[PDB]
Amino acid sequence: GWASTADPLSNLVLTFSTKEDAIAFAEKNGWSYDVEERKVPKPKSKSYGANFSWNKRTRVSTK
Amino acid sequence: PFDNTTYKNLQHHDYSTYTFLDLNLDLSKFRMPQPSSGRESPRH
Numbered sequence: 001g002w003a004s005t006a007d008p009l010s011n012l013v014l015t016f017s018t019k020e021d022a023i024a025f026a027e028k029n030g031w032s033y034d035v036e037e038r039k040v041p042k043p044k045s046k047s048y049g050a051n052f053s054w055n056k057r058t059r060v061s062t063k
Numbered sequence: 064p065f066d067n068t069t070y071k072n073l074q075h076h077d078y079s080t081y082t083f084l085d086l087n088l089d090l091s092k093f094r095m096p097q098p099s100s101g102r103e104s105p106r107h
Contacts, residue, residue: 053105054100055100055101055102055105056105057102057105057106057107058105059105061105061106
């Protein structure tokens, strides 16, 4: 009852520093490839005082 | 005259449970209108 496989490349994950070098390595070995972009987190705006605003809706109900 | 041998805080023996609350109720008529934030609650 183990997981028996027949694909030799299932445990082949490679690491590259930059995107263009990985693209060059993909084109070099003749593999059809697709690229997903780097999802950087957007810079949020944080403020401790907004939890205790005089009239705004961003007051904390409890602390 | 001058008295210095008697304790003048003898009224505090005659305070009931609701003296603070009814004092606030009587004193509420002398207060200014409170400021407004524009909404009845921050959850609104």
